Amino acid sequence: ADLLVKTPEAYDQALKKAKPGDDIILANGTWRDFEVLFEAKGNENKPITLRGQTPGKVFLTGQSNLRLAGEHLIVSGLVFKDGYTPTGEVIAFRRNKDVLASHSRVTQVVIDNFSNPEKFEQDSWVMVYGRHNRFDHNHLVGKRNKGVTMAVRLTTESSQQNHHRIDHNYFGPRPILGSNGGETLRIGTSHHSLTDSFTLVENNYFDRCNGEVEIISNKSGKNSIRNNVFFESRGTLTLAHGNGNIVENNVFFGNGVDHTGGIRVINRDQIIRNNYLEGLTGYRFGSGLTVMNGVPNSKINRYHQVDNALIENNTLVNVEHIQFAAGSDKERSAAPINSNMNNNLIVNDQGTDGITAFDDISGIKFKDNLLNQDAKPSINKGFEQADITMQRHDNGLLYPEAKTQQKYGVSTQLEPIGKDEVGVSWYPKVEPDVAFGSGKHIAVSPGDNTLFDAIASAETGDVLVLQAGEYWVSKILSLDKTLTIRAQEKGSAVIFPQRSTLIEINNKGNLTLDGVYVDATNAPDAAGNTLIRTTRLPMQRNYRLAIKNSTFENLDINHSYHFFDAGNRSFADYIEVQDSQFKHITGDLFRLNKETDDLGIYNVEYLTIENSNVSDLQGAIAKVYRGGTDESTFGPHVVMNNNIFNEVGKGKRNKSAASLILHGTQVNKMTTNEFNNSAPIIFELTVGEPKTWVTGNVFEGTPEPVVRDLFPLSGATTTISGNTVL
Amino acid sequence: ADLLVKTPEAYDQALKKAKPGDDIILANGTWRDFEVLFEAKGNENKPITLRGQTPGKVFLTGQSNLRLAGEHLIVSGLVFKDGYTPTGEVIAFRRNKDVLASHSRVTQVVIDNFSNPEKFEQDSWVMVYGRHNRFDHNHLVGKRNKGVTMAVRLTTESSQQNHHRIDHNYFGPRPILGSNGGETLRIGTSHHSLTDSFTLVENNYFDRCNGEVEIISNKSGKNSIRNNVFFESRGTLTLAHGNGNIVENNVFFGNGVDHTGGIRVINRDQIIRNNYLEGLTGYRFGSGLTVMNGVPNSKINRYHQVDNALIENNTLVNVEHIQFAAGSDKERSAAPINSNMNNNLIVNDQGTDGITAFDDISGIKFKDNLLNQDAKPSINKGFEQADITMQRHDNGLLYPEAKTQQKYGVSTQLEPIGKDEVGVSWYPKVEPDVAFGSGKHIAVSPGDNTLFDAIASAETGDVLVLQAGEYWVSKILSLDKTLTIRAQEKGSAVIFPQRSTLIEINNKGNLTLDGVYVDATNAPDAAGNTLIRTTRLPMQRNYRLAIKNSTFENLDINHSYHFFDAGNRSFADYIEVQDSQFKHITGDLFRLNKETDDLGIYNVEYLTIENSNVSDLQGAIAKVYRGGTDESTFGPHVVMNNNIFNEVGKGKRNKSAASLILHGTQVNKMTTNEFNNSAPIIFELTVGEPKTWVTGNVFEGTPEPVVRDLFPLSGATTTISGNTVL
Ligand SMILES: O=C(O)[C@H]1O[C@@H](O[C@H]2[C@H](O)[C@H](O)[C@H](O[C@H]3[C@H](O)[C@H](O)[C@H](O[C@H]4[C@H](O)[C@H](O)[C@H](O)O[C@@H]4C(=O)O)O[C@@H]3C(=O)O)O[C@@H]2C(=O)O)[C@@H](O)[C@@H](O)[C@@H]1O
Ligand SMILES: [Ca+2]
Ligand SMILES: [Ca+2]
């Protein structure tokens, strides 16, 4: 029977009287603050269903969540948006610890940016318990807070040996968390990694899941992770804990996107076969292929020795790093044993074969692995060279044209599931970011508050074009959308801030300045001014900041007039300065050092300053800080080239005494710069083997770069060469 | 004529056509975001009035304010609430720097928690300019942000020599700022303090004005502060800058409340006569009567030598500190000069007369002063003892029973104005705090998010009574009201947190935990958990936290699991732990060290731990920090008696290497504790002559107390005695 319900109370009555075979039907509409406890007992061939009347037209908003409990249940056709769960998870396969759900299915459900507003209160979106449950054809996108998106729980035997099936799901874009805990899928936990889960994870599409280094974190036994697609995703499929796992038929399209892994092998009896990997640029534990060194003999929470890994019939095209025995050190002294790497195909366009060994690899028997002539080998036995021409098939995968060479690599029958073959047809897969300049151009004339008004009425992605004239700003400009402020004629538009802040970046705000000139002479004669800042509230979305062809002068009417000040727990997807000029500033340029509690949280992923001129700056050019020992993130990157810095950072209120102080930054590149009469660069290198290059610069009147290694000598590759000190 | 208006447009029209003698009447209701400019020109006896239709029914909310410009204006019957001023003031006697108001009157206006939500965005509530203005029968309560509540500016000679008159106002409870800049009334500034103001401040009631050390800051010449009543106010009447002032017929009822001043005499030609001071406990610069030493040569922003002070006919009853030549040091080297103290009456029942002289006091002649028999004299010439019996007259003041003795101290004619003779009779004077356990008792049972719902439905002041069982908590317990959580049988209610936060203290939230048992084993496996914390957003209300008979165990599933985490710019009125046990915690216990910018800002007024047990805490018992050189506040106060600390503070991530680290705390008492096998106590003494007592403790297996003095040698009194160091 069909049981249409239009109020929660009516839902409560229908649940009390549903029978095996009935459908409880939630009427089309918006159900705000609806905590669904769907607790019932269907039969094997007569389930009890909870469905939205029209998939796409039932929305659960506000503090809404779902919990299944009982057996033989089905939930379908709901959308969770505009809100966030009041509990630890949006969808849970249990009432609580006392009543689990088994033999139940959740299908065609959408969770779209149902993100907790506090970026670091932790939750998950899907939490699976019990046994023989299915989570299929669902759509999850835009999780911006701490916490893995979907987890299989194993906390009781009831939930173990579960044979859960997780298939045909759209695991859509997850922005960078800027901390640890941004996994998309976790199966089990270190404390239960020795139990057998038997989870099948098949035919899912992972579309730019960029939350952290582990996309999938396997932490239990005998799971099968097969036939998935990982598209431009920053991270890896990591067999972190647990033995006896099968990783087959997966496809990785990194497209050369920065920091794409990766199958990471740890522990024992893992089977890695018939996987196709292409365009992966990740390195170290994010490499395209990684066989770890273990710790012997601990201790569930530590990585154990790789033992009886079988690694066969994989294809690796333009994979920049294949790492054997990676992580080797005093704790990770257990090199691989009893393994086999057979019939793989490695093709690499830039000379090398990407392989690097960090310990004895005699524990891996290599046999019948093909690589291309130009690809210089790193291992003698097990790898031969040949002339390959790779040609793309109708399935989208590359293969040797020689039919002899097709006993190497993946089978020609691999059909990677398509992005349009997962999720729900009735909910659109969209781009997560508004592109700059994607809207309309809007002419703005000078005056009083004309910049304020043009912003309030612009639509997201528009471009404000400033005619010639002066622009006085006596109201703080708040940015809650993607906006470019361009000058019609470069340098002909002059903005005069009149308040302690000129531009506050808010949730959904992203800013490009292009050709503007800022004279801060008329700012409030007070200390602490911040020309540009994020909202001082905790944010929920990352933000983008580009500054091109712009000039910013006279931030000096009182002390500590900062150019950019990031708020606590804020995160810039990138901050980029280009062909811009700065003169006379009494405070710091970029304050990205706010996360002082040393948990691995940082404020920016890519800071880039190129072709720009900074003169008379009392504070630092950048204070960037990522404290602690976490190795789950990839940033910050700091890249600064072709700039001229004069009289920078000598100020007395600059306690760093540096013109750049980078603590915990993981990629540094300072090339072809001028550091005239300034304070020195200071690095404080931490965990994770950070890579630093400072080559080709002038240090006239500025001391030499200073390297403080707080974790020596743990792999930190620093190359400070090619500079001339005067 | 009466011009009733119902909209701002209709208000503008009524103002254009109004003439001397008319009344612009704002219609009853709520006027949101109404920035009122009331500029007009009345006549000496035909004023132009702006007034609410019914006093008590016209509300200006949101971003509203009031400016007065012209002459012979009157504003009356308005209530500012539910918002804050979008400029520098809520009420201002000027349009701007060049159009002021004179001969104008603000009367019967209420400002009630119209506080800017960001504690350290500074505004004032009332700003007077011009001449011959009046501010009377008003009601100001609940200003929670930096900035004097009301000031009289002398920016120009147009605003000097004003004879302004400020009378019959209720200056109601102002909470402890936790910082400099929480004065109630300021009359001038330092730079203008040599101009005469002739402002009269009379018949006002200051009720728990606890913003900072200065209740009133006089910084002008020839003002007259008389017939005011200061009730349980934690501050002083300070003659900061400016000469020729008279302080007379004032009444101070301290009621023995902590940190009650005080008339502080600085500068020249000050008359202090016929004031009644009783039950004042303040000391150093917040003493009941303070005669400062000055700076001799001799700028304006500098306290100048006391010269020709007249201090006569005052009555001081249980005034614990009367400090002569206070502040004497190398810069403040000019002792009082040409002054006189006559016919005062000191009656103290604590063995002493409370007098301390810190320098040569021959520049003060004493004549005909009386003291009770039991008080040990500190001066003999000009003082004479007698048998004194004090009876309380019907004006509420104590007078000698002997007629012979009535020529010392205050006149019997004084009539101190009551609390019910100020403000408006149509707006209530309520209590600023809800008392714990003032509400009703609500029984609670376990366990399906049972505690969360009991909190949702409770009313402020209520007492939840947890029946025996387990309370599994999957939602954050957010408190926006005063509330007690009691176990019906101590230790029989067990609370299992399952989130990174269990309890969030929000605005208006205040918590007592009595007899609860918390086991946190099931918290999320992630670093940085906090069992209890303030909101991470900006907090407007101070909070109170009391923890009794309660046990908190197993906060150790991952590193840095703190028990209490204070949020930036938050402030605890007190934190009180009594008879409680804590076990196995990897983070700190009380993180009260968040204000690292060294501006005088702190996080707690009283931290007290007593009769309690902590074992296996890797972080500190407390990290409480107040940096800089500000001397405007009174705390923190840290008191720890009769505890047993075991295996505390030795954790690798405790950068303090301390078990207790107090920087800038002003009163410290560690007595009869056991510090077994722990990191040491570490004091970092700052300014303010702080007082420290470490007596009777066993430091077994723990280094002795470290004491660092950032400012030796100041008056820092430190008494480390009677401890056993094994
Ligand atoms: O001389 C010494 O021994 C002692 O001097 C004491 O310092 C006093 C000064 O008398 C100052 O008054 C000061 O009060 C300041 C406020 O702190 C604040 O700076 C305020 O700011 C004004 C600003 O000056 C300007 O006029 C602007 O237009 O308005 C601002 C505003 O509304 O805040 O100005 C006050 C003023 O000038 O008095 O600090 C203290 C004071 O008593 O509060 C004493 O603090 C002691 O430490 C010295 O040893
Ligand atoms: Ca992690
Ligand atoms: Ca002050």
Side-chain angles (χ1 to χ4, degrees), chain A residues 35 86-87 96 118 121 536, chain B residues 118 448 475 500 533 536:
Chain A
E35 293 172 44
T87 63
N96 56 40
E118 246 174 328
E121 193 74 37
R536 283 185 236 89
Chain B
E118 256 163 3
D448 207 72
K475 298 171 172 191
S500 20
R533 62 172 177 87
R536 306 207 193 78

Side-chain angles (χ1 to χ4, degrees), chain A residues 678-716:
Chain A
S678 322
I681 314 179
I682 301 191
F683 304 88
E684 290 163 9
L685 302 186
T686 52
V687 315
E689 299 176 9
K691 333 184 86 44
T692 304
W693 303 257
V694 193
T695 70
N697 319 87
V698 176
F699 296 91
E700 196 146 345
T702 308
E704 227 173 359
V706 173
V707 184
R708 323 173 163 171
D709 204 328
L710 294 69
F711 277 92
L713 322 76
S714 96

Side-chain angles (χ1 to χ4, degrees), chain A residues 120 133 198 248 252 293 301 359 408 448 484 494 511 523 542 611 625 647 675 692 694 720:
Chain A
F120 290 98
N133 289 326
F198 291 117
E248 57 180 347
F252 293 74
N293 262 20
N301 57 356
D359 202 319
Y408 311 99
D448 280 72
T484 309
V494 182
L511 173 57
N542 304 337
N611 301 314
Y625 185 99
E647 303 281 358
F675 280 75
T692 304
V694 193
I720 307 184

Side-chain angles (χ1 to χ4, degrees), chain B residues 270-428:
Chain B
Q270 324 284 22
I271 300 167
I272 283 75
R273 64 162 61 106
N274 202 68
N275 309 274
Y276 182 97
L277 298 80
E278 169 180 338
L280 307 175
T281 71
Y283 59 82
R284 194 159 172 275
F285 300 153
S287 300
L289 172 63
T290 298
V291 184
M292 281 281 100
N293 254 38
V295 170
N297 291 310
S298 152
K299 225 315 167 305
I300 224 148
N301 56 333
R302 305 301 307 239
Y303 292 160
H304 287 190
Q305 161 175 255
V306 160
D307 186 356
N308 185 35
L310 212 222
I311 303 175
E312 39 169 32
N313 281 105
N314 304 277
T315 287
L316 298 96
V317 179
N318 299 337
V319 173
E320 294 174 13
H321 289 98
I322 302 168
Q323 308 218 318
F324 293 122
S328 203
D329 65 26
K330 242 43 185 298
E331 186 99 41
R332 283 197 291 250
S333 65
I337 280 299
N338 298 130
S339 306
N340 288 277
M341 189 155 173
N342 332 312
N343 293 87
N344 306 270
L345 164 65
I346 309 183
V347 171
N348 192 317
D349 65 14
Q350 302 155 23
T352 196
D353 66 10
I355 293 178
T356 304
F358 295 87
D359 201 325
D360 195 350
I361 49 146
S362 18
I364 307 163
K365 272 185 43 55
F366 295 85
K367 183 169 199 246
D368 277 317
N369 299 288
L370 196 58
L371 175 70
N372 59 294
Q373 267 312 336
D374 307 328
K376 185 197 86 66
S378 297
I379 300 172
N380 274 347
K381 198 98 186 171
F383 292 72
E384 102 187 63
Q385 290 173 101
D387 202 287
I388 298 171
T389 306
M390 300 280 269
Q391 35 215 32
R392 191 164 314 268
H393 282 15
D394 294 327
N395 64 1
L397 307 192
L398 291 156
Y399 293 86
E401 162 174 42
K403 297 292 173 225
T404 328
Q405 270 160 19
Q406 295 207 342
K407 76 152 180 171
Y408 315 93
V410 302
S411 150
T412 74
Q413 282 323 109
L414 280 171
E415 280 286 347
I417 182 155
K419 196 199 178 172
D420 58 9
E421 297 178 62
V422 295
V424 287
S425 40
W426 52 264
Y427 205 85

Side-chain angles (χ1 to χ4, degrees), chain B residues 179-183 212-214 217 219 264 303 630-632:
Chain B
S179 161
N180 178 63
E183 308 98 325
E212 69 144 73
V213 69
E214 289 182 327
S217 192
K219 295 173 165 165
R264 208 212 307 195
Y303 292 160
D630 179 83
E631 302 184 32
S632 293

